[PDB]
Amino acid sequence: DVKKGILLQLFGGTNKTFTKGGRYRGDINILLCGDPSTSKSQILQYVHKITPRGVYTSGKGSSAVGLTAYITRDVDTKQLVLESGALVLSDGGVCCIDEFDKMSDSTRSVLHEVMEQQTISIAKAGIITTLNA
Amino acid sequence: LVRSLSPGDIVDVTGIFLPAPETYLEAQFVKFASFSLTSDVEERVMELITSGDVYNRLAKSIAPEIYGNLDVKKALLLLLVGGVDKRVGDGMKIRGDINVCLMGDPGVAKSQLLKAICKISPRGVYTTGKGSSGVGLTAAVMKDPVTDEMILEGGALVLADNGICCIDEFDKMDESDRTAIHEVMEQQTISISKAGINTTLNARTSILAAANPLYGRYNPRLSPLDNINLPAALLSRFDILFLMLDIPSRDDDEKLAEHVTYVHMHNKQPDLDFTPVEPSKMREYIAYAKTKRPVMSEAVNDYVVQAYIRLRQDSKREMDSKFSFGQATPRTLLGIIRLSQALAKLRLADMVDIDDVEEALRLVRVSKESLYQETNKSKEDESPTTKIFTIIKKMLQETGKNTLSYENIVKTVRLRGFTMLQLSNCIQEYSYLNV
Amino acid sequence: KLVTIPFLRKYVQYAKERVIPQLTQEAINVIVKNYTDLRNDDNTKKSPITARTLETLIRLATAHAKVRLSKTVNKVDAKVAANLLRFALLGEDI
């Protein structure tokens, strides 16, 4: 019953785009629960190797900055650049996150907009831009 | 020769020293798998095999300044060798390393055992808990003062690849330091996502931590999970969980005081029944056994499954008791396989026998029986009337009648080995009480 | 009669480079008997007596013999180390 749901996540429903209507998220958000040591971490390592744009992150290892877009700088021009995160580089694949219950409160609030409108709106340092994810 | 130097290798770069009007080196010619099979080294390995009892000799040669703890030193010998890394063709890499954790009161020479295994292993890095945070344990993203490029400096879990990682004070660690530990004990990788560097570094190390109780000494009135400030998720990944309790005893303290005074006097170990093995020759025997990959036998597969059922049944009945340990997780089943495969490498055998499975299961029962006392009583040699009563229970199971005419039970007693005179006295005794 | 400051520095360097004390059979039985009695006393529960106390008594006995320029550890050097350890663990002058 668990493998039957992950198989549909790789395929997923179509994206019926509308011109005068809102965008509906067609992805399948699956959450695994139960006791650990039950081949839970092995599933996240197999979907990443199949998806060409899949990533693998942890709970405490990535806060609300590593998943969004960290404001990095170029080592050639010394300018404020915008680098993509774990949720932006996976434009079209499945994101595998380990230890979902060990995340901070500032990181769980950002995923509320990604699982609804599939958009990440960041308004920091006077830069209010909406990133698609 | 370009595109052939990997960061983290130990090679002999041969070139010329030419200055630059800065001094550079023009490259001209460029681990356990780098040691060649020299005829002189192979002769020293065969000298220890023909001597007999190689498993008990190397188990007592480690830590010559620590007396006692024979079962604790046996697990440290398999940590230097380890199991096999069976790579499945589908894409699964089974971890062959062993996860051993030492616990108990801080007085069983915990700091000496961690430093003894570090000098023996060629790629061992010793570290603490509070002194090494999340930056020193994983990888530090520093800036290059020349090319101005963000490199990845190796810390404790990176420089100790294919070795043994010694971690001291596992209970005094922070919450941000256990992030990379959960990934090494599962996938042997380190997920780094800092300074725009989203790369994964391999970490095939052997974590050997040493936890300490929160209240200093151990409390038998409290649960083992509440006495140690460690969650149940970390105990499931560890294969062996020792517990060296400092029990005051007049016999153990007398033998320990004599061993300490002998070391601080002659600067050597007391004379036993065998010669101590030098650390220069011990590294040749471990590296030679790592090349041999033993295969599990088919007759020993039935004993592993039957042992997991008896181990899971005993842990389920002790869930409401005072010594409530961890649940029978599937990770504990794979730990016995890795311990049995590592025991076959020391005997230079390509097949796992039944003796390797019983020896691996004994180390797990010892670490689990450290809380119980040494008071074991067993008696089962009463009158032979109880053995005859078992034959009567077989007739009642198929039928269930308490008649006086018994003509079929007499034929079963004769086939066993008992006489007919003692059988008549047992039937009359049970017939008086109507059984 | 107190010794001067520069004369006390010369006694430390000369004793730590020419006198090597050794544990005799008489000093071993005193340290072993004193170590077992400290771990069995109920009043020594304020400080955890581990394996370091066994090595501390041997280091204090060897350092006390270097003051008298003696190559052997007698029973007098073992009584000073036993009384110094009891004052630091219990805190009472016995």
DSSP B212-235: --TTSS--TTS-HHHHSS--HHHH
Would you say B83 and B97 are in contact if contact means Cβ atoms under 8 Å apart? yes
Would you say C23 and C32 are in contact if contact means Cβ atoms under 8 Å apart? no
Side chain identity at residue B357, one-letter code = V
Residue B389 CA to residue B17 CA, distance in Å, equals 93
Distance from CA of B256 to the nearest CA of C (A): 9
Distance from CA of A133 to the nearest CA of B (A): 18
Q: Which two tokens stand for residue C78?
A: 């073992």
Q: To what resolution in angstroms was this structure determined?
A: 6.1
Our measurement of the distance from residue A34's CA atom to the centroid of its chain's CA atoms, rounded to an integer in Å, reads: 22
Side chain identity at residue B230, one-letter code = L
Would you say A59 and A103 are in contact if contact means Cβ atoms under 8 Å apart? yes
B381 domain-assigned: no
Residue A63 CA to residue A54 CA, distance in Å, equals 18
Residue C51 CB partners (closer than 8 Å, separation 6+)? B107, B108, B109, B256, B260
Phi-psi region of A17 (alpha: psi -120 to 50; beta: other; left: phi over 0): beta
Residue A14 CB partners (closer than 8 Å, separation 6+)? A26
| Strand-pair partners of B17 | B25
- What are the φ and ψ backbone dihedral angles of C22, each rounded to 5 degrees? -130, 145
| Strand-pair partners of B430 | none
Residue A10 CA to residue C56 CA, distance in Å, equals 66
Residue B45 CB partners (closer than 8 Å, separation 6+)? B284, B285, B288
Residue B59 CA to residue B78 CA, distance in Å, equals 9
Q: What's the count of helices (H) and strands (E) in chain C, helices before strands?
A: 4, 2
B89 domain-assigned: yes
Q: Are β-strands A55-57 and A95-97 bridged in parallel, bridged antiparallel, or unpaired?
A: parallel
Q: Which two tokens stand for residue A108?
A: 């769980």
SS3 C87: helix
Would you say B294 and B345 are in contact if contact means Cβ atoms under 8 Å apart? yes
What's the Rg (C-alpha) of chain C?
Answer: 15
Residue B167 CB partners (closer than 8 Å, separation 6+)? B114, B127, B128, B129, B156, B207, B208, B209, B210
SS3 A55: strand
B97 domain-assigned: yes
With b meaning 16 or more CB within 10 Å and e meaning fewer, what string describes A78-101? Answer: eeeeebbbbbbebeebbbbbbbee
Q: Which two tokens stand for residue A12?
A: 């997923």
Residue identified by tokens 């530090």 is B140
Residue A61 CA to residue B175 CA, distance in Å, equals 11
B416 domain-assigned: no
Work out the number of other CB atoms within 10 angstroms of the CB of residue C29: 14
Work out the number of other CB atoms within 10 angstroms of the CB of residue B224: 20
Would you say B269 and B363 are in contact if contact means Cβ atoms under 8 Å apart? no
Residue B144 CB partners (closer than 8 Å, separation 6+)? B150, B151
Q: Which two tokens stand for residue B181?
A: 């530990």
Residue B148 is part of which domain span? 38-367
Residue B237 CA to residue B80 CA, distance in Å, equals 19
Q: Which two tokens stand for residue B41?
A: 């080294």
B74 domain-assigned: yes
Q: Chains B/C: 3 or more C-beta pairs closer than 8 A?
A: yes
Would you say B315 and B323 are in contact if contact means Cβ atoms under 8 Å apart? no
Residue C90 CA to residue C29 CA, distance in Å, equals 22
Q: Which two tokens stand for residue B20?
A: 């630059």
If you ran DSSP here, which 8-state letter would residue A100 be given? G
Residue B220 CA to residue B227 CA, distance in Å, equals 9
Closest CA to C44 of C85, C84, C5, C2: C85
Number of structural domains found in chain B: 1
Residues of C within 8 A of B257 (CB-CB) are: 31-32, 35-36, 54
Residue identified by tokens 């900055």 is A65
Nearest CA in chain A to B151: A75
Q: How far is CA B120 from CA A4, B126, B274, B283, C20, in A?
A: 49, 12, 20, 7, 31
As for chain C, the residues directly before each break of C–N over 2.5 Å are none
Method underlying the structure: cryo-EM
Q: How far is CA A5 from CA A1, A24, B91, B303, in A?
A: 7, 20, 21, 36
- In terms of C-beta density within 10 A (0-12 exposed, 13-18 middle, 19 or more buried), how is residue B193 classed? buried
Closest CA to A116 of A27, A3, A4, A8: A27
Residue identified by tokens 């071993």 is C28
List residues of B whose CB lies inside 8 A of any A CB. 91-92, 148-150, 175-176, 178-180, 182-183, 186-187, 191, 193-196, 198, 200, 233, 236-237, 327, 329-331
Q: Which two tokens stand for residue B34?
A: 């780098």
Our measurement of the distance from residue A7's CA atom to the centroid of its chain's CA atoms, rounded to an integer in Å, reads: 18
Q: Which two tokens stand for residue B297?
A: 């036998």
Would you say A110 and A64 are in contact if contact means Cβ atoms under 8 Å apart? yes
Residue B357 CA to residue B351 CA, distance in Å, equals 12
If you ran DSSP here, which 8-state letter would residue C2 be given? P
Closest CA to C57 of C80, C87, C25, C89: C80
Residue A113 CA to residue A120 CA, distance in Å, equals 7
Residue B366 CA to residue B45 CA, distance in Å, equals 31
- In terms of C-beta density within 10 A (0-12 exposed, 13-18 middle, 19 or more buried), how is residue B420 classed? exposed
Would you say B355 and B340 are in contact if contact means Cβ atoms under 8 Å apart? no
∠ at Cα C7 (C3, C8), nearest 5°?
Answer: 75
Residues of A within 8 A of B330 (CB-CB) are: 37-39
Q: What's the full length of chain C, in residues? A: 94
Would you say A93 and A53 are in contact if contact means Cβ atoms under 8 Å apart? yes
B283 domain-assigned: yes
- What are the φ and ψ backbone dihedral angles of B154, each rounded to 5 degrees? -75, 135
B362 domain-assigned: yes
What's the Rg (C-alpha) of chain B?
Answer: 29
Strands (E), C31-89: 72-73
Closest CA to A90 of A133, A30, A47, A44: A133
Residue B166 CA to residue B118 CA, distance in Å, equals 7
Closest CA to B26 of B37, B14, B38: B14
Residue B40 CA to residue A64 CA, distance in Å, equals 58
- H/E element holding B15? strand B14-19
A/B interface, count of CB pairs below 8 Å: 54
| Strand-pair partners of A68 | none
Q: What's the full length of chain B, in residues? A: 435
Residue B65 CA to residue B295 CA, distance in Å, equals 36
Dihedral sign for Cα atoms in the order B168, B173, B177, B178: positive
Q: Chains A/B: 3 or more C-beta pairs closer than 8 A?
A: yes
- H/E element holding B166? strand B164-167
Would you say A69 and A44 are in contact if contact means Cβ atoms under 8 Å apart? no
Q: How far is CA C81 from CA B143, B253, C94, in A?
A: 54, 19, 14
Q: CATH code at B130? A: 3.40.50.300
Residue B413 CA to residue B394 CA, distance in Å, equals 12
B415 domain-assigned: no
- What are the φ and ψ backbone dihedral angles of C66, each rounded to 5 degrees? -75, -20
SS3 content of chain B, % helix, strand, coil (to 5): 40, 15, 45
Closest CA to B290 of B62, B38, B34: B34
If you ran DSSP here, which 8-state letter would residue B145 be given? T
The upper half-sphere exposure of residue A27, i.e. CA atoms within 13 Å in the direction of its Cβ, equals 15
Orientation of helix B250-266 relative to helix C52-65, angle to 10°: 40
- H/E element holding A124? strand A119-124
Residue B31 CA to residue B406 CA, distance in Å, equals 77
Nearest CA in chain C to B255: C32
Work out the number of other CB atoms within 10 angstroms of the CB of residue B58: 21
Across the interface, do B264 and C22 touch by the CB < 8 Å criterion?
Answer: no
Q: Are β-strands B164-167 and B189-194 bridged in parallel, bridged antiparallel, or unpaired?
A: unpaired
- In terms of C-beta density within 10 A (0-12 exposed, 13-18 middle, 19 or more buried), how is residue B304 classed? middle
Closest partner residue to C54 among B106, B256, B265, by Cβ? B256
Q: How far is CA B290 from CA A5, B83, B121, in A?
A: 41, 8, 13
Closest CA to A23 of A111, A110, A113: A113
Would you say B27 and B16 are in contact if contact means Cβ atoms under 8 Å apart? no
Across the interface, do B331 and A37 touch by the CB < 8 Å criterion?
Answer: yes
Across the interface, do C32 and B261 touch by the CB < 8 Å criterion?
Answer: yes
Long-range contacts, stretch B27-32, CB < 8 angstroms, 24+ apart: B27/B1, B29/B1, B30/B1, B30/B4, B30/B5, B31/B123, B31/B162, B32/B122, B32/B162, B32/B287, B32/B290
Nearest CA in chain C to B264: C58
Q: How far is CA B398 from CA A120, A121, B394, B401, B407, in A?
A: 74, 77, 7, 9, 15
